[PDB]
Design a protein around this ligand. Structure first.
Ligand SMILES: [Ca+2]
Ligand SMILES: [Ca+2]
Lengths: 491, 486
């Protein structure tokens, strides 16, 4: 669903500088008249391209699925997943690609050239034969330009791979070759798999510099996608970009994860969704936001109410290309706790909704010496300690001064949240237009114990993930399913 | 321009207009509405298509049964809008017989599956109704109802000019405000521009030009106004309709004449911009006409013009009169250069405009210059360039498109406060997706904003927003992201 192919994905001023040998403006112009298509994932790795008057246009069948031919709605919806579509440059030209996977049907990845709906081509297919550590590819891949001079599919190896290892896979966009496999150690002898990565570009040039990804073990890993040496003044320079830089890619912090997520009792919390990054308020480093949860196995269809899943905000203070041979080892104790303190039914204007209010505890980042005090925050997905097995499996959206996320609670029910990325708590401004006003105003606020407060969470209709768009008027909106909510990124 | 998708308004702006209604429920219901595009066909004929150019609907006015560039304008372009009547919100479509006959019609296009005929108006209903080339405006009035406000059109029975206020629900002529121009000279009121000066969604004034070049203003408020809240809705009701009248005691705000003293027809609707002093408004209007066959030919004998006239009595004042003005009281602006250049990798032929300041007041508040003007000509070369399309004023810029028969389209982004070059880049001529220095031009070894650029003549001016929430002006064939100003 979120995989629609209409206009060019980027703005020319951003894409063109990435590829001097190409012409994005002419590519963009061409796509202005491209026949829109929406590709949806099915049971296995099956792809059914069709939309706008829902006319079946295309259908793809993986070699693994084509040869084989020789629970619940919320859960099935997740399992079927959705392919990733993006614009990429290779073969000397811009293309619109679609990256899919065999889902739970098998261990495989595939990419299609979807630039011309009337002429979809198969770029490549990856299986265990090509990548021995490839597992069930539930992770959502990212398509990006890397410092090795080329575009690649960057994703986690997935789950239940042959040796239960976790690794970042960097697949050449054009060839499907494994440009680099960045294995992570983590805890051994215990099943692991790397999840959806979030690429970081810290000098706004369209070339990915770092990648962040959690794993089934709850480790939040960072990977350096830049050369060993540096240029110090501008460590993210493209000057030495080339195929050789690929060998320099490495797990960051000497192989130590930025963080290892465990619940209140100390039990590991799997991370499925991609992290989100927000520049730290001091402008030094970034706050890495990630939530825990897992939903790929049948057993996961049922709520695990033995522990709470959690949303974390961890300070990565070494994001300026420093060697970063290591990183602080943190625990919830080094973070500021936030809580979901109230769930209630209320009416905003005329619209009735069930909402949740979060705490608003400040985070004390530095002591007067300048040394680090709290390194972040956390929020257990539970209202006043009641465990319902609420978890995060969908990617989040960080914009302005807010982080938007959607959680799922297997019964499943969906809760959309708008939180302060700097604290993990309630924003000081109202985020959602819950009153269907067309704008974000006080009509959407809630009276929490004599206090007019911003609503941090609201329950929304059947699963649909979260998408950020702009309603005709320049106003940003966040949509899930059935409802889109005008949002306020902050003053 | 006549596309019917989601609700036209943001709820917080529409709801206050009709407390007895629920725009929220209306808007929600349209979120799922099947998008339709309505194209005004051969004068009268109206065809509806789906997002995928598919014959979905077609309307043939009783008039019909009663039995390249020039054709684009003469053909049509219906007006769609959300209006309130019958105690509910509806999406209406106002059509005109155009060159076919003399009449207007309104359709209820709220439900693409069940379109209804609201009403049809002809000379039988409105004797002074002429060929309906003027573009109507759907608006809420102080008489308590929504109405179709438009110019009576051209070559009407007695060639008179009048503002027509047509009840939205009934199609009845609520008021006909006749205007007195020059004797024996054929006249007709053109597309009006309604003004809402206290931003509550209820029109207060209407401005419209006529074939004689007069720019008229009409008071759409009660005669007995409360100086503390002249635009108040407290006394709204049918009793207010009788007080609607021609402003300034029957005198036009301005009478447009070319540099040689000849009258300049006004066909396009004016555009309003609050005066920098916050007192009054700058009434911007362009000159030209293209509804008659002879108009297909370029008139190279004179230069058409764009004017910015200061109306200093826009706060409910009785305004029994208005200053008699001429080019002499206005600051001139000129198009000093036209050249072909390349912005980024996109080739474009552009024009540079002067940037002469406007001196509005004396130390004691006395009025010096009452506006500005710009003759559509480069270095005095007359090509017959004229404005026949509505303009778009947003932020600190007025966007307009002129047509040069022979036809060639020129899109301009000018400073509304002076009619000259903006001090900032307006158009993204480099196809960067954003407006940056790549779109500026070196004028006399100085970076300066480009005020005009030639378009692939075939469309009009439409303002929209890109996926990134930024202003974008499209000209059928190409959209240019724009910068409304700092
Ligand atoms: Ca970079
Ligand atoms: Ca008003």
């Amino acid at each position: 669903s979120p995989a629609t192919v209409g206009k060019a994905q980027y703005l020319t001023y951003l894409a063109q500088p990435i590829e001097p040998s190409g012409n994005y403006s002419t590519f963009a112009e061409a796509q202005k008249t491209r026949a829109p298509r929406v590709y949806v994932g099915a049971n296995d790795g099956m792809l059914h391209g069709f939309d706008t008057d829902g006319n079946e246009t295309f259908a793809f069948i993986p070699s693994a699925v084509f040869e084989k031919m020789h629970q619940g709605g919320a859960h099935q919806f997740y399992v079927d997943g959705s392919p990733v579509v993006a614009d990429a440059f290779f073969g000397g030209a811009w293309h619109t690609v679609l990256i899919g996977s065999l889902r739970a049907g098998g261990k495989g990845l595939f990419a299609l050239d979807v630039t011309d709906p009337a002429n979809i081509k198969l770029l490549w297919e990856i299986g265990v034969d090509q990548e021995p550590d490839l597992g069930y590819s539930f992770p959502k891949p990212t398509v990006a330009r890397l410092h090795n001079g080329k575009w690649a599919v960057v994703t986690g190896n997935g789950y239940s791979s042959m040796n239960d290892k976790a690794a970042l896979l960097i697949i050449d966009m054009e060839t499907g070759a494994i440009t680099r496999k960045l294995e992570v150690t983590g805890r051994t002898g215990v099943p692991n798999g790397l999840s959806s990565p979030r690429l970081a570009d810290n000098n706004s040039d369209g070339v990915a510099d770092y990648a962040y990804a959690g794993d089934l073990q709850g480790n939040l890993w960072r990977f350096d996608l830049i050369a060993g040496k540096v240029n110090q003044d501008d460590p993210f320079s493209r000057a030495n970009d080339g195929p050789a830089v690929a060998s320099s890619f490495r797990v960051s912090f000497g192989g130590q994860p930025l963080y290892s997520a465990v619940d209140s009792a100390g039990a590991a919390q799997a991370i499925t969704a991609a992290p989100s990054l927000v520049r730290h308020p001091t402008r030094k480093g970034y706050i890495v936001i990630f939530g825990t949860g897992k939903y790929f196995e049948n057993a996961d269809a049922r709520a695990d109410t033995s522990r709470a899943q959690t949303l974390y905000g961890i300070w990565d203070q070494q994001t300026k290309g420093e060697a970063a041979g290591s990183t602080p080892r943190l625990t919830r104790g080094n973070l500021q706790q936030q809580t979901l303190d109230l769930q209630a039914d209320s009416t905003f204007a005329s619209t009735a909704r069930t909402i949740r209010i979060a705490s608003q505890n400040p985070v004390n980042w530095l002591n007067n010496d300048g040394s680090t005090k709290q390194s972040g925050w956390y929020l257990d997905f539970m209202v006043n300690g009641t465990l319902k097995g609420e978890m995060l499996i969908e990617d989040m959206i960080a914009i302005g001064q807010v982080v938007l996320l959607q959680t799922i609670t297997p019964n499943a029910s969906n809760w959309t949240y708008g939180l302060d990325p700097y604290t993990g708590g309630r924003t000081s401004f109202t985020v959602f237009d819950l009153a269907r006003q067309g704008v974000v105003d006080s009509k959407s606020d809630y009276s929490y114990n004599k206090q007019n407060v911003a609503v941090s969470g609201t329950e929304q209709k059947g699963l649909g993930g979260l998408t950020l768009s702009t309603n005709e008027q320049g106003n940003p909106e966040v949509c899930s399913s059935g409802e889109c909510l005008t949002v306020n990124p902050g003053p």
